[PDB]
Amino acid sequence: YVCVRQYDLTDCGAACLSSIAQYYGLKMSLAKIREMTGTDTQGTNAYGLIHAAKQLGFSAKFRLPAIANVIVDNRLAHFVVIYSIADPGKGIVRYSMDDFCSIWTGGLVLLEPGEAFQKGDYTQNMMVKFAGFLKPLKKTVLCIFLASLLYTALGIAGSFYIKFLFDDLIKFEKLNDLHIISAGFAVIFLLQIFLNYYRSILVTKLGMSIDKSIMMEYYSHVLKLPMNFFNSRKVGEIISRFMDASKIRQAISGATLTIMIDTIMAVIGGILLYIQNSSLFFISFIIILLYGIIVTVFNKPIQNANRQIMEDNAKLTSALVESVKGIETIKSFGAEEQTEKSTRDKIETVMKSSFKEGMLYINLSSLTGIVAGLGGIVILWAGAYNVIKGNMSGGQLLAFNALLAYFLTPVKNLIDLQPLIQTAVVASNRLGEILELATEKELREDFRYGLRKPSGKTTLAKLLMNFYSPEKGDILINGHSIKNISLELIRKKIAFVSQDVFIFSGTVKENLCLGNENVDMDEIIKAAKMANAHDFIEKLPLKKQRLAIARALLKKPDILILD
Amino acid sequence: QNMMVKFAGFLKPLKKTVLCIFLASLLYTALGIAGSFYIKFLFDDLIKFEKLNDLHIISAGFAVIFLLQIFLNYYRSILVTKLGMSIDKSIMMEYYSHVLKLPMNFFNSRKVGEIISRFMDASKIRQAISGATLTIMIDTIMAVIGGILLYIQNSSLFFISFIIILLYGIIVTVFNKPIQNANRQIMEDNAKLTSALVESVKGIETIKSFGAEEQTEKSTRDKIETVMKSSFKEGMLYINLSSLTGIVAGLGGIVILWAGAYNVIKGNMSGGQLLAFNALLAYFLTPVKNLIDLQPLIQTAVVASNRLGEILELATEKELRESGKTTLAKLLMNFYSPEKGDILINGHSIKNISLELIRKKIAFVSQDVFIFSGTVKENLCLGNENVDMDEIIKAAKMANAHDFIEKLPLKGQKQRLAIARALLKKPDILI
Numbered sequence: 001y002v003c004v005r006q007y008d009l010t011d012c013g014a015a016c017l018s019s020i021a022q023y024y025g026l027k028m029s030l031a032k033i034r035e036m037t038g039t040d041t042q043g044t045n046a047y048g049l050i051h052a053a054k055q056l057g058f059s060a061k062f063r064l065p066a067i068a069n070v071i072v073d074n075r076l077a078h079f080v081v082i083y084s085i086a087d088p089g090k091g092i093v094r095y096s097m098d099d100f101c102s103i104w105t106g107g108l109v110l111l112e113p114g115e116a117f118q119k120g121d122y123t124q125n126m127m128v129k130f131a132g133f134l135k136p137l138k139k140t141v142l143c144i145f146l147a148s149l150l151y152t153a154l155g156i157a158g159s160f161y162i163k164f165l166f167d168d169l170i171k172f173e174k175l176n177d178l179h180i181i182s183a184g185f186a187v188i189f190l191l192q193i194f195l196n197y198y199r200s201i202l203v204t205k206l207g208m209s210i211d212k213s214i215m216m217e218y219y220s221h222v223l224k225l226p227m228n229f230f231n232s233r234k235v236g237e238i239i240s241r242f243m244d245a246s247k248i249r250q251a252i253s254g255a256t257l258t259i260m261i262d263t264i265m266a267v268i269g270g271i272l273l274y275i276q277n278s279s280l281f282f283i284s285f286i287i288i289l290l291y292g293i294i295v296t297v298f299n300k301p302i303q304n305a306n307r308q309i310m311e312d313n314a315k316l317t318s319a320l321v322e323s324v325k326g327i328e329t330i331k332s333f334g335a336e337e338q339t340e341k342s343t344r345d346k347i348e349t350v351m352k353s354s355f356k357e358g359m360l361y362i363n364l365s366s367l368t369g370i371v372a373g374l375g376g377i378v379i380l381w382a383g384a385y386n387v388i389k390g391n392m393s394g395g396q397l398l399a400f401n402a403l404l405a406y407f408l409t410p411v412k413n414l415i416d417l418q419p420l421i422q423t424a425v426v427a428s429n430r431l432g433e434i435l436e437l438a439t440e441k442e443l444r445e446d447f448r449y450g451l452r453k454p455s456g457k458t459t460l461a462k463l464l465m466n467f468y469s470p471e472k473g474d475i476l477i478n479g480h481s482i483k484n485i486s487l488e489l490i491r492k493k494i495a496f497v498s499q500d501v502f503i504f505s506g507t508v509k510e511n512l513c514l515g516n517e518n519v520d521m522d523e524i525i526k527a528a529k530m531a532n533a534h535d536f537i538e539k540l541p542l543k544k545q546r547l548a549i550a551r552a553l554l555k556k557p558d559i560l561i562l563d
Numbered sequence: 564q565n566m567m568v569k570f571a572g573f574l575k576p577l578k579k580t581v582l583c584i585f586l587a588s589l590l591y592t593a594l595g596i597a598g599s600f601y602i603k604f605l606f607d608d609l610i611k612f613e614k615l616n617d618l619h620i621i622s623a624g625f626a627v628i629f630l631l632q633i634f635l636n637y638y639r640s641i642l643v644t645k646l647g648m649s650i651d652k653s654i655m656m657e658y659y660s661h662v663l664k665l666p667m668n669f670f671n672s673r674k675v676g677e678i679i680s681r682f683m684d685a686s687k688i689r690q691a692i693s694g695a696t697l698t699i700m701i702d703t704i705m706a707v708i709g710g711i712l713l714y715i716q717n718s719s720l721f722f723i724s725f726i727i728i729l730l731y732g733i734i735v736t737v738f739n740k741p742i743q744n745a746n747r748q749i750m751e752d753n754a755k756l757t758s759a760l761v762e763s764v765k766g767i768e769t770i771k772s773f774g775a776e777e778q779t780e781k782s783t784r785d786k787i788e789t790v791m792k793s794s795f796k797e798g799m800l801y802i803n804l805s806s807l808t809g810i811v812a813g814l815g816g817i818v819i820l821w822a823g824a825y826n827v828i829k830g831n832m833s834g835g836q837l838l839a840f841n842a843l844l845a846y847f848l849t850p851v852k853n854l855i856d857l858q859p860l861i862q863t864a865v866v867a868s869n870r871l872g873e874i875l876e877l878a879t880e881k882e883l884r885e886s887g888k889t890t891l892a893k894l895l896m897n898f899y900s901p902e903k904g905d906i907l908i909n910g911h912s913i914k915n916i917s918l919e920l921i922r923k924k925i926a927f928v929s930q931d932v933f934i935f936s937g938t939v940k941e942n943l944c945l946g947n948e949n950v951d952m953d954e955i956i957k958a959a960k961m962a963n964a965h966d967f968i969e970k971l972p973l974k975g976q977k978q979r980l981a982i983a984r985a986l987l988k989k990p991d992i993l994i
Contacts, residue, residue, distance in 0.1 A: 075974065161817070161820065162820065165820065165824050169824065169828075170824065170827055170828070170834070173828055175825070175828045175829075178821070178824060178825065178828070179821075182817065182820075182821040185817060186814060186817050186818075189813050189814065189817060190810070190814075193806060193809055193810050193813070196806070196809070197802065197806045200802050200805075200806075201802065204795065204798045204802070205795075208791050208794065208795060211791065212787055212788070212791055215787055216780075216783075216784055216787065219760075219780065219783055220776075220780055222764075223767075223770070223776045223779060223780060224776065227767075227768075227771065230764070230767050235761050235764050235765060238764055239757065239760060239761065239764075242760065317679055319935075320659075320678075320679045320682070321675055321676075321679060322933055322935055323663075324662075324670070324675050324678050324679070325675050325933065326931075326932070326933040327663075327667070327670050328667065328670075328898075328929070329929060329932060329933060330663075330943075331667070331898070331922070332896070332922070332926075332927045332929070333943035333944060333985075333988070334919065334922035334923055334943070334944070335943035335944060336663050336664065338943060339663060340656075340659070340660055340663065342936075343656070343659055344656060347652055347655060347656065348652075351648050351652055354648065355644070355645075355648060358644045359641075362637065362640050362641065362644070365640075366633055366636065366637045366640075369633055369636070370630070370633050373629050373632075373633070374626060374629060374630075377601070377622065377625060377626055377629060380601065380602065380605060380622075381618070381622040384605050384609060384610055384618060384622075385615075385618065387610055388609075388610065388613055388615060388618070394606070394610060398838070440771075462768075465772065467768075467771070488774065491771070491772065491773075491774045492774065494772070495772070496772065498766075498768050498769060500766075502762075502765075502766030502768075502769040502770075504759075504762060504763060504766070504779065504782070505759050505762075505782060506782075514769075514773050514775050514778065515773030515774050515775040515778070516773075551773075555773065
């Protein structure tokens with residue numbers, strides 16, 4: 001019935017628990033649930049889900065809704081909830097249908113509801129939060145709106161050229177002012193194009209500003225998050241969330257501007273078509289309603305075909321990489337024909353999926369083309385019939401054709417905005433869910449890496465700083481408990497060298513100067529006395545372990561620890 | 564060049580589909596021109612003379628013609644997509660088949676991700692061949708016919724249309740290269756930003772330890788400002804191109820209306836023929852407008868075809884012939900050229916008869932091994948069940964029945980399986 005789509009590869013269990021919460025009330029963000037059910041890079045397990053259910057108030061350990069582990073769907077430990085007998089990665093399509101018994105072999109049906117848990121929404125309408133970036137710059141939006149209004153006035157005025165030409169300048173020969181009117185309408189069109197140019201400049205600048213603002217806010221909050229957030233996820237997820245700002249901007253800017261502008265456009269166009277002729281306007285409305293019906297019903301088949309394409313292409317690329325990595329083994333066993341046959345089969349599957357998507361596009365395009373062209377022919381036929389009876393004039397039909405184009409274009413654009421907004425909404429729930437996470441400083445005043453059964457030497461090193469929270473520790477410092485004093489003091493007091501070496505974009509003379517802006521340019525050379533990569537050969541700064549050691553000693557720590 | 568050779572090779576066995584598509588396109592265009600003549604009849608012999616039954620009959624006939632046009636377009640599109648799919652699959656399979664038979668000197672010197680990337684290039688090549696169809700299907704012939712028909716109505720209006728299309732072509736040709744340069748700069752700046760972001764995220768431990776969040780924030784802000792300035796430059800080029808094209812097209816339309824109307828007044832031309840000329844100008848401008856825009860799709864196509872051809876040019880493994888333990892193993896299996904001594908390997912110079920004998924009679928155990936598919940997959944030397952792989956490789960020493968012995972699809976156990984169960988090929992020597 002109700003489901004929530006997964007945002008990443010390794011949160012199937014979190015998504016399933018979120019869906020159960022959706023069915024029974026609570027609507028917490030997936031990111032908060034993800035952190036609650038001990039989600040790691042590998043994924044969650046039944047213990048994580050039962051612990052999270054107990055934390056949320058559920059009393060679990062058959063009832064209609066329950067989460068069952070599924071083995072053979074992918075290699076990311078999928079969970080699928082059962083409704084009647086909702087996979088987040090695919091949707092709702094049923095598998096059991098009165099028992100099928102192919103993915104239940106795990107037999108991990110575990111979840112049931114329980115005692116009252118303060119039902120109610122716990123999330124926001126977060127799209128408004130991102131849309132609030134239009135408040136600091138409202139002059140640009142107003143200028144864009146004024147330019148659009150003038151552009152429409154000029155376009156509608158200029159579309160009556162053919163009517164003025166055929167009603168008066170042809171039947172009532174006036175070959176003296178035809179040149180004057182032609183020059184006037186050329187001037188109107190030139191002003192229209194200049195206004196389009198100016199509006200495009202403003203829209204591009206506004207989009208750039210929105211991109212930069214959202215990207216920088218997200219990056220700042222990511223850098224402010226604690227270490228468990230970085231441990232739980234990989235780098236690809238963070239980069240994808242970073243790239244979702246473009247989709248958020250597209251939603252805000254394009255959707256809002258197009259909605260207002262095209263609503264005004266459709267209202268004005270409908271008014272003028274109704275004034276020109278009622279029957280032709282009714283035919284136009286029928287055409288646009290049919291187009292809206294036809295486009296809407298094909299969006300979800302198109303999305304499903306696209307998802308199948310993505311999945312099949314991912315499988316093919318994985319197979320190709322697995323074949324290339326290990327080409328030595330394929331050559332060693334001396335059998336490459338089998339690999340060619342397997343790749344042929346995978347390519348054929350990808351082609352079948354692409355052919356299905358291609359038929360979807362071709363059928364949609366042909367239906368829309370039938371609607372548009374046959375509606376144009378019907379409009380010409382009806383206009384001619386009305387002109388025969390004298391209701392209209394010869395040129396009023398062509399004026400109506402031009403206004404019809406200028407009225408159908410906005411509503412065609414507005415209806416085509418239905419899918420884009422949707423995906424951008426998803427992008428919001430993929431990005432801003434991170435923003436609700438409390439930062440490192442907010443949560444301040446043996447050991448486990450998250451529901452992972454209580455490199456042990458390294459963990460003690462990381463525990464020495466406030467990277468994590470202990471259960472039995474802090475028995476070496478000469479003072480008192482670490483948690484009761486400022487984090488910044490621990491940061492400037494403890495220096496350590498990681499397994500790898502981190503060097504960021506910048507010259508060597510400032511890589512050692514990382515973190516602090518006061519070096520006096522003498523401490524660097526003082527610390528350089530201990531293996532400065534043998535003075536790094538060239539005194540001229542460039543732009544690795546020796547650099548890390550020099551940075552550690554230059555930091556001047558009260559306590560120094562090294563691998 | 565090899566480009567034309569590959570085009571001819573991949574297009575020869577599908578001549579029937581190409582001819583069927585060409586015939587469908589010609590019939591579609593003829594029906595389109597006939598349908599475009601609707602408005603001339605409507606505003607000449609129907610509105611003026613006040614005919615009703617004739618109006619209904621002609622309207623129904625033109626609806627029928629348009630429906631036939633849609634059906635022909637649907638059929639032609641199905642055939643085109645099938646042809647493109649077949650050409651793409653043939654190209655991809657040929658490229659993979661040639662990659663799969665190259666010496667290891669090719670594989671070890673190139674990245675894994677570089678090999679798969681060329682597959683995408685294959686898709687691009689398909690468009691090129693499909694683009695070729697355009698140069699014969701909707702342009703040239705299909706344009707020339709339409710162009711000639713325009714000269715039937717009015718010479719001055721046709722000359723104006725030709726000037727319009729020449730101006731549009733000049734604008735696109737001029738604005739082509741700077742757009743490509745701006746796009747290249749965008750790609751470079753995005754790559755730099757992504758590299759900086761990934762490097763900063765991976766080394767987050769040191770960033771938190773040294774208290775340098777603000778420095779990284781400022782550096783990333785600088786990089787985003789750089790990429791945004793480059794994106795603004797590209798957007799400026801697109802906006803300039805779009806504005807000049809819009810001026811040309813719209814001003815040309817106004818000029819055609821004005822000039823045609825001048826001739827209606829003068830007497831040479833007539834009424835509804837002006838509307839017919841406007842409605843039929845599509846079948847002359849859109850064809851040529853679809854090939855003036857074709858220039859970008861060839862620059863990608865030519866470089867993709869060139870790189871695929873230069874990869875395919877490499878000699879095959881069988882053509883070249885008519886860490887100490889690893890090196891000796893490689894020399895024994897005749898993978899690498901003789902190094903540190905070119906005398907012999909063992910017994911006799913085996914690089915004289917057939918490499919297949921060496922590959923079949925000599926086994927090898929690897930430090931790392933990949934496993935895919937089911938149990939039968941790791942039996943690349945097969946052709947018989949052979950009493951369940953000689954009783955699970957003489958299972959007296961090891962059984963490991965558990966869940967692996969049967970034919971389940973699988974997707975320290977890796978080498979444990981490989982070494983113990985990779986000796987079925989009856990090796991002559993070496994484990």
